[PDB]
Symmetry: D2
Amino acid sequence: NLTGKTALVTGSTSGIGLGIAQVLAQAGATLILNGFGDVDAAKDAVAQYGKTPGYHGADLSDEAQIADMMRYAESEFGGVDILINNAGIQHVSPIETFPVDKWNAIIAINLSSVFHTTRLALPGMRARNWGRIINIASVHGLVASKEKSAYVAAKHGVVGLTKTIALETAQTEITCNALCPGWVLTPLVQQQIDKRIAEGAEPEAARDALLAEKQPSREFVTPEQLGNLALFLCSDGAAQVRGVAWNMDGGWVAQ
Amino acid sequence: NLTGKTALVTGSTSGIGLGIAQVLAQAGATLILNGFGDVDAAKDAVAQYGKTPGYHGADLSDEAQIADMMRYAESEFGGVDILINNAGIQHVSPIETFPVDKWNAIIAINLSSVFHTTRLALPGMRARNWGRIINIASVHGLVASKEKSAYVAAKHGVVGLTKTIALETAQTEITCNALCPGWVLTPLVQQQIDKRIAEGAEPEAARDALLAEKQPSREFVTPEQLGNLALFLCSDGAAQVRGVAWNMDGGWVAQ
Amino acid sequence: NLTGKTALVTGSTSGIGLGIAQVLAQAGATLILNGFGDVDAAKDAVAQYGKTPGYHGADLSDEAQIADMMRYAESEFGGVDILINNAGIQHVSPIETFPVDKWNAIIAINLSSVFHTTRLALPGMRARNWGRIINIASVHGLVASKEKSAYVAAKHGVVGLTKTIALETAQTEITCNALCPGWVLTPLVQQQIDKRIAEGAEPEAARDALLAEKQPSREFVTPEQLGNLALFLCSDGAAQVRGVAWNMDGGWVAQ
Amino acid sequence: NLTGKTALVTGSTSGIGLGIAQVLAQAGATLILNGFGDVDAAKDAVAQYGKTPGYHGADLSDEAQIADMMRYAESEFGGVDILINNAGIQHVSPIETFPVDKWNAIIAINLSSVFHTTRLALPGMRARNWGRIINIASVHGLVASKEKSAYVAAKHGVVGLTKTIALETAQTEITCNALCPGWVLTPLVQQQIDKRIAEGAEPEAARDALLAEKQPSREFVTPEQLGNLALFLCSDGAAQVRGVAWNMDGGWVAQ
Ligand SMILES: NC(=O)c1ccc[n+]([C@@H]2O[C@H](COP(=O)([O-])OP(=O)(O)OC[C@H]3O[C@@H](n4cnc5c(N)ncnc54)[C@H](O)[C@@H]3O)[C@@H](O)[C@H]2O)c1
Ligand SMILES: NC(=O)c1ccc[n+]([C@@H]2O[C@H](COP(=O)([O-])OP(=O)(O)OC[C@H]3O[C@@H](n4cnc5c(N)ncnc54)[C@H](O)[C@@H]3O)[C@@H](O)[C@H]2O)c1
């Protein structure tokens, strides 16, 4: 189904990216993992679904390490066919006391890394005339929240970047699209929940408290749901899906 | 997959609607077709892939006929689990010389029919706590083209309507979403192309004729691709996709 | 400034329409008022700012009365130069128990009247090659709220209708735009404010009780603020403002 | 009107920024210009309408220079009341061969400079509980065009950033909004028009040529028209306009 396709999922040693990675693995694709933390756990969790994945530990905030990483992809796997730009970081702060370092890193990782990977994978994709570039944005690429200025900017930046590359590839068999999830039950978010429960909150009170304001369904998006959406974007049934910001968000943007 | 679930697709005797019906049918779904023309050919086109579909010939511009269709879906098939609002007529004209009956018929069929089917299907869906409401809007639900004032107003309307319904059902296992296609290769459009080709035009040349202005990829969207996106919305993968307006449009809205 | 221009504002006997009228009259415009209730109070509240206004009691839910009103505008003032479609009505209800009557009325008044007025004033505007069509929609022409299906549909529809008419007049000195306010302090909203104060709530506690969820500024838009925006749209600095849905909403849609 | 208020306009030694500076000056504002080129001409061009403006030559891609500009504003004029982020640069290129240094420059100037200038002005504004922040994005903050990946990403970014700042200030008398113009008749545009006219093109034909694809009115936006929209945003009539992205574009985004 995706057999003979190489998928690069950026920041896939945890959360959403690992979810998406496992799903593509299940579908038959060769995966290259990226990101820090528990790395052989990440490799193995994907390995259980087919081919053992490759790995490059590029720090995405560094243009040099990305170039290195892409050559590795090309030298060892013959070039990326499916590029999932997923990695990203957060910093919540009022703007007047938002750290400049944090601004530069959030831009570098959440916006500029998508430019750099897409830059380096596209030539190979054009030669083979086939490709999938999927950028994991956020609801915050479509709307904003207070105290997330660098993140909302970068993610908005991602959405615009995506429509551009889509138009640049419009007349080829290469598509470029963005997913915009709302709250996803990742390691980070389950932490916030379990330690509301620890305060005395009932589970389905800890959850919807954290989700009431922004997400009408009062339910989380799962990494698996996103992985299934990315897989549909990789399918032939998505041949004319181009330049889109598809939200999976329990009703967030509809509101 | 969709075995034991009843899907009603309005305007499914031809084109986009018929394509979506076949795709749900092969996925196990029990269908009810709607529309005019060669019904037995529409029936046979579906029964080829799955169960012999039901049929009801309601004029969608008549509120009472729609109610009979829902009374039919309830009696004979146990109610609607998957409601696909699809049918949608057209009249190109400057607003100044735009016939009032034409405005009224377009609003009634392309907008008011969506209100009627969804309000009569939703109680059954709520009792079972499961349902999918999928409205086929268009790119013209998100942007405008000149001389399509009634059509754009209706489709915009359908998008708004979809968002509202999703919010009223956010905390259930019932979702409401809109799909917004660009140019779709219907038989209606194959005939535009053939007639051009019959006058000396190269095939690709006739294709670029129709698509160069509004659709960057210059490739049509197919009913099948739309069926596959509709089927994904029906999956468990789409539990938290709510009140969206997803463009499948060769890059149309991206400009 | 606007002296020598005729402005027709629908539903201008109360609230938002009356405010816009008073501002336009102040700017020199001849006004034609429309709407029900305390008519003389409205006529005089306008005439205090200069020229004493005209009036027509067309029920905008009926197509033929709008034809009467418009032909009265032409046969008594020599046409409309500035058409403010403001009239609107509301019904809050879950969809499955939404009255069909209210649905039809809300569509007729909030959406279809804009079609009927615009199609009748436009020929005259085209002859004089100058015109302002300004449609008061809502934030609900852009996002949705539960239990307001007919209203959100109509207003979304209005936004789409505006975009098309703007494209149709693109190359003339006629512009067509929409305004999308959030909560505005009109007599119905103030009556809800006093409702809570009498309940025991302190004033600035009753307002944000009404505005917290949807309007981040926790401050009302005023009919005067809207009238000043509409006036700017009538100016020549707004020559190239076309197809627009400008929100004035205290941060509603940014969220 | 604006008497007593200090306005800083980045990139105001020419074009859009100079047009906006002139409109604010004649409204009574004290201006601080910024940018390169013929500075004394720019000062003179503003002083003819109102007070002799200040100037600061900060490189907007350099964060420390920006902070010196703001320290200059605090020391010489008492702080910024009206901050207008206007300065923006362009590089047209397919992403594959898009120079890195150009990507970094465009992001820094068109996006990060908005963050730095706004984070430094906001304390002053908050203390006085009054302020306007107006960011000149472009239609490319809302849609994409081919081969402007850095510019579209940056401008989209500005739009997101604008929304989130609006929200951090929603309950103050400080507003933050984005203006998104289409093609503006700047000197560069007028001089590429003269180029075509010098080669035999009729005037309208040359303008038609430049505007045909993307701007339906086929008429340019002017710096003065933009200045007057900015000035309206600075009025009390705009108190509840927050985190908007208002297009003034001859119908570009309406398509
Ligand atoms: N968690 C949510 O609710 C949510 C919602 C919407 C969008 N998103 C987006 O999905 C993406 C993944 O977020 P997540 O929730 O799965 O978090 P996560 O921490 O679980 O995983 C993020 C990945 O990014 C990696 N990473 C961080 N910095 C890196 C760097 N400099 N170089 C290389 N890798 C780096 C991490 O190693 C990790 O593998 C993000 O872009 C996020 O904005 C998340
Ligand atoms: N009040 C708000 O907070 C708010 C917010 C956003 C948008 N709007 C919209 O502004 C417009 C007016 O709102 P409002 O608050 O001033 O209401 P309002 O009740 O104070 O008065 C509006 C006008 O509508 C007239 N009207 C109603 N039905 C009519 C009919 N069949 N024929 C002729 N006139 C009719 C009324 O006579 C009145 O003059 C509407 O379109 C509304 O949706 C209001």
